Amino acid sequence: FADAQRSHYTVYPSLPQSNKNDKHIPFVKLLSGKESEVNVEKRWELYHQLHSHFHDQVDHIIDNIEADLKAEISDLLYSETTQKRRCFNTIFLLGSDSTTKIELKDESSRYNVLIELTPKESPNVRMMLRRSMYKLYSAADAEEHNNDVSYDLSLVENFKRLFGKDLAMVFNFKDVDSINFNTLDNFIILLKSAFKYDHVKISLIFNINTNLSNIEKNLRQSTIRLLKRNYHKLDVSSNKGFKYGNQIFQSFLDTVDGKLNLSDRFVEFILSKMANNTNHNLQLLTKMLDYSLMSYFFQNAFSVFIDPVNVDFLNDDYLKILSRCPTFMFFVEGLIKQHAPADEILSLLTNKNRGLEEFFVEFLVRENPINGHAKFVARFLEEELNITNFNLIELYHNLLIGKLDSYLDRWSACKEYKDRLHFEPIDTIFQELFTLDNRSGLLTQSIFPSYKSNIEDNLLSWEQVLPSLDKENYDTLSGDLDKIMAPVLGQLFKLYREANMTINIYDFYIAFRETLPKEEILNFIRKDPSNTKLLELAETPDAFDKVALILFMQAIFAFENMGLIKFQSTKSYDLVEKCVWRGI
C-alpha cells in the first residue's frame, strides 16, 4: 500500500494482554525438546551471573585506562619550564583515537582552558580562531561565579586586564591526521604571535593516529623548528605494553575458573582476529568473548551442570548426550585395552544408568589449573623477572598447546627458570561438552563473515538456500517449476559469471532466453482463475519473448542496485560492465 512510500513511519504494535507463561527469556527447549523449564530459568540466571561478573571487571579496566591516561598526560603537561620562555609546550599523543577527556589542574591566579578542535570545526583559519576565542571567553566568564568582545587574539592581549588572571590555554586537536595541515600550520603561525604578551602559556596537544613521519612531512619546516622547542611524545595505544589485554583476558578466566575451558582453535582465532585490527582491540576482545559465551549457554544444555547444586537433575537424555563424547570413548577403550573386568564395562556401556549418573559428578571436583597457574607465570614475568612485553593470550595459547618452553625461550632471559615456569597439564574426561570452541565456524559466520563471498555463493549455487520438495506440487501454482527452472536473478548470475567484462545486454538477454523452458511456460502461463489479462498475451504468437523480457529486465534492474552491474554510456544504457567477480 501507500505506507511504504513515506520515510520513517513509526508504528505502535498492539499486543495481546497476556498469555500467562514463562516465555520471558529467549532460551529454547534444548535436547530436541526434552529439557525442564526450571533448568532453562536456572541457565538464564547463571548466564546472567557470569556475564555480570565479567562485565563488572571489563568496565573497571576500561574506566581505569582513563584514570591512567589523565594521570599520564597531566604530568608532562605541567611541572617543567623552558629557558627560552617564548615557546609553546607540545605533546604528540601517538596512536590515540580522539576519545579522551583532559583534566587541567588548579594552579590558582591562572585560568586553564581546553580548546578541543576537530576537522569539522576547522574549515579554515578564521573559524578556528573564532571557535577558540569563543571557547576561551566562555570558559573564562563562566568560571568566575560584561561587554562583548571580538573573537580574535586581542582578547588574549587584554585577558590580563579584562579578568585579572594569567592565561594558560591548552589546545587539543582531535584528529590531527584528518585536519588540513595547511590550515594547522597557519593556525600555529597565527598562535605564535601570542608569545609577546607575558601572561599567556600556550600548550599544544596533538592526537595522532599515525606515525610522526607523516606529520612532519606535511607541515612546513619553520613550524617544525618552532615545534622542536619543547616537544614530548607519548605512545597512547592499548597494544603497546600489553597491560590491558592482560587484564581483559585475565578477567575472563576469573569467570570461567574451573567451570568452562577454552579450546586451542578458539584462542588462536582470538589471536588472529585481534592482530588484524589495531585501533580498537579492547572492544574486539570483549565482543568475541561475550559472543562465545552467548553461543554456549544458548547451545549447551550441560551449562546447567556448571553449578554444583544442579547435579541431581540428570535425566535420561543427558545420559544419552554425555555418553557419546569421544573422550569418554577413549576412556572406555582404555578400560577395555589395559585390563579386562567384564561386568563393570558391561554396566557402564549401555545398561547401568546409576553408575554413569554418579560417575560424572566426581568429574567436577577436579580443577587442573591452566588459568590458575597462568597467573603465576604472569606474576613471575612481571615482578620477579621484570619483563613487561609479554602477551597473556599468546602465552596462554602456547600453554594450552604445550609448546610453552619455546615461548619462554623466545626472550632468552629466563634460562635458569624454564623448570620454575614449566607446567605440563593433561585433559580431564568430559572436556568436550564444557569447552568454549569454534569448530562449526559460528564466530566467523556472524561476527566477521565473508560478506561478498556469501552473497555470490547464494547467487550462484542457490540450492543451499532454496529447498526441494516432493509433496507440495499440485495444491500450489508452480510445482514443476522449482525443479526444472532456476530462479530468475539466480539464473542470470550463472551467465553473468562466465561473461566478459563488457556485456552486451541484448546478448545477455538472448543467453537468458534460451536457458528457459519453452514448451512448459506456454502451458504454465494459463493457470490463473481470477484474472483474464494473463491468458490473452498467451494467445499472442510471441508470448515467450514478451514474458522473457519482463523477467530479464526485472533481474537486470534488480542486480543494478545490488552493485554487480554498472551501466556505462549514459543516455544509451545498453552495454553493461561487469564490476564484481566471485571469489574476491
Partner: protein, 253 residues
Amino acid sequence: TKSASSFLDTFEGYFDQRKIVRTNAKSRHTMSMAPDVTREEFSLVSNFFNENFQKRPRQKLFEIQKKMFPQYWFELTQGFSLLFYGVGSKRNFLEEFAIDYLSPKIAYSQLNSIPCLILNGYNPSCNYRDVFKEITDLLVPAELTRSETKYWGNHVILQIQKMIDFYKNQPLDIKLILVVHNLDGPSIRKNTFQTMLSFLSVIRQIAIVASTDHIYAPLLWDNMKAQNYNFVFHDISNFEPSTVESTFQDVMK
C-alpha cells in the same frame, strides 16, 4: 561459449576477462530489437511471477528461518545490533520480525508496547533531521543548553552525544526498536547519517535492526563506525521478488 576465458572467477578470473576485444569481434546490438512491451504487461506479469514461481519454497524458507527469532532477540538484548544481508528483499522479514515477534517479547519481559520506528532507507527522501525529530518525541530528551551547544555546531550530533552520556546512569531496557530498511540506500549511505545511526547504537536502550542491499556495504564503516554499531551479521538471503523498492528506482525503457 561467448566468453573465451581460460580462468573463471578469482583474481586471475578478474585479470583474464578484462582483455581487449577488436572492433569486428564486438557485438554492437541495441536493445531496441528486444521485443518491446507496455508498462501494464510488465506490471501484470511481474506481480504474477512474484508470488507464483517459487512461493511455497520461499514460505518454507521463511518458516525455516522463523525459528531463529529467539537468537535475534537474545543478541539484541545483550547489546549487539543486527545486520541482515542477503539476496532479495529483507523488508517483510523485518516487518514480520520487529513488529510481530520482537516488541511483544520485549514488553512482557520487563514487567503499551515498545515503540517501533521503521525507517524506509530505500527512499531517497530520507533526511536525518526529521528522522531525529521522530526520535526526539518517542524518547523526548532534554534540550541543548547554551554551554553544551557550541559555535555553529551540529545540534543533532551534540544532542545524541548528550543522550549517550545521559543513558549511562539508567536501567537497561529497550525503549525503541529502530528498523532500518536498506541501510546502504541512496540517501542514508552518506556520512552524517551514518554518524547519527552509529552514535544511536551506542545507547543500550535502543535496538538497531538494520538491513543492507549493496555488495560493497561494509566499507561504509571504519574502526569507529563498526565499533559503535557492534553488528552481528546474519545471511537471511531468501530470494524475494523485491517489488516494494523497485517502484522508487527508474524502470525506464
